[PDB]
Every structure is written in C-alpha cells, then in structure tokens.
C-alpha cells in the first residue's frame, strides 16, 4: 500500500520518531509497511510493532467503553429516548476497532507467525494473536463470539506451551503472556479461579528464578511480577 515506496529502514526510523511524538497511528502505519516488506522482524522491531498497535487499539477500547456505558444507561428504565445516535456512534468506534484488530491479525497470518521459529519471536506473535482476538471478544455480542473467544484461547495456549518449554519463568515475554492470559480467563472466559491460579503460579515460579538474574534483568522481571500481584490483590 502507501508505504510500498519507502525503504524498510526509513519506515523503522520514522516509527521511532512517531513514538517520540506520540503519533501512534503513524507509528502503526509505518510498522505495517515494514512488516509488508516481507523480512522477519528483530526483537526491537517486534516491540515497535506491538507498542504502535497496542496504543492505537488502547485508545479505541477506552472510547468504546465510554460509549458502551452511555448506551447501557440509555437502556435503563426511566431513561429518556434520545434516538439512534448513541448506538450509531458506538458502532462506528467498534467497527474501527475491529478493523485495527483485523489488520494486526492479518499481519500475523501473512506471514509473521509462519516464519517465526525462535521461541522469543513465536511466543510474542502468538501472544499478540491472543490479545487481538481478546479485544475482538470484548466487543463481540453475536453468533461468532464463542469462536472469537476460542481463537484467543487457542493462540494463548500455544504461546504458553512454547514459553514453558523454551523460556525461563522470569522471561518478560513469558510473564506478560501469562498476565494477559490470566486477564482473558478472568474477564473473557468467565474463569476467575483459573485467572487467579495462573497469576499465582506464574508469580511464584518467577520469584524462585530471580536469583539467576543480573540487576537489569531482575528489574525487568519484577516490574511485570508486580502487575500479576496487582491483579491478585484486586481479585482476592
């Protein structure tokens, strides 16, 4: 598409500038163009791709939640009829959000995942696939909702299986994957006990492995462990 004429390295450079300028839509478009060059992504490049799209969808999701809450209030007893506008605008934001999720899932399917052989890349991309199906599940209300949820589950489960075999329990990708799969269990799959068990086991196994780490790696791992602890404190 529109990035086809720009050099891969220039797209990467501009994605980093867009990040500094908090221009996340631009950042995502540059990283999509970089992926579409067809070469595998380095660790830093995968992080740029993820940061860009997580910020774009994160803004859409927050807006969707505001509009969904207004719509839900509109449907309570005693609420004045205000016409179709709230539903229409929530649907507009929802459709945009679904489009971005479909875009990310398309990049993962064509062809990031199939070319990713190292644990660090494959787990990262499968986690991303689980996340974007999870974001689709947050807004799903129809006949494919069960299949969207199962798609998120299946991607997370494959990422978990690889991460347990191939990564240490303190690895930041393994930890962030477990954090997100635990959130999936809690608020998507109606499985709070599974969410709590996963967060606790992940935390405890990471704790036991901290002694192996340098100071910098210790800081990286404990930062994510604290997010697991935050959720356990909220949920128990």
């Amino acid at each position: 598409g529109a990035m086809g004429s720009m050099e891969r390295a220039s797209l990467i450079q501009k994605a980093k500038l867009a990040e500094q300028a908090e221009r996340y839509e631009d950042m995502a478009a540059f990283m999509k163009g970089a992926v579409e060059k067809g070469e595998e992504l380095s660790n830093e490049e995968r992080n740029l791709l993820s940061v860009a799209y997580k910020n774009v969808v994160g803004g859409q999701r927050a807006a969707w939640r505001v509009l969904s809450s207004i719509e839900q209030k509109s449907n309570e007893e005693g609420s004045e009829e205000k016409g179709p506008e709230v539903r229409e605008y929530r649907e507009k934001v929802e459709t945009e959000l679904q489009g971005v999720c479909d875009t990310v899932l398309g990049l993962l399917d064509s062809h990031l995942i199939k070319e990713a052989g190292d644990a660090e890349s494959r787990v990262f991309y499968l986690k991303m696939k689980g996340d974007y199906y999870r974001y689709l599940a947050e807004v799903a209300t129809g006949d494919d909702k069960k299949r969207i949820i199962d798609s998120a589950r299946s991607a997370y489960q494959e990422a978990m299986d690889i991460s347990k075999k191939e990564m240490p329990p303190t690895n930041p990708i393994r930890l962030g994957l477990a954090l997100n799969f635990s959130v999936f269990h809690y608020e998507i799959a109606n499985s709070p006990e599974e969410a709590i068990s996963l967060a606790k086991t992940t935390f405890d196994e990471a704790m036991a492995d901290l002694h192996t780490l340098s100071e910098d790696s210790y800081k990286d791992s404990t930062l994510i462990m604290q997010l697991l602890r935050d959720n356990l404190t909220l949920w128990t």
């Binding site: 997580k54 996340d131 954090l179 997100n180 959130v183 608020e187 997010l227 935050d230 959720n231 909220l234």
Partner: peptide, 8 residues
C-alpha cells in the same frame, strides 16, 4: 482500580 494487562 482497573486490572492490569501488559502495558507500559
């Protein structure tokens, strides 16, 4: 307090 997912 909203639950944490993997974010900066």
């Amino acid at each position: 307090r909203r639950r944490k997912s993997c974010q900066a």
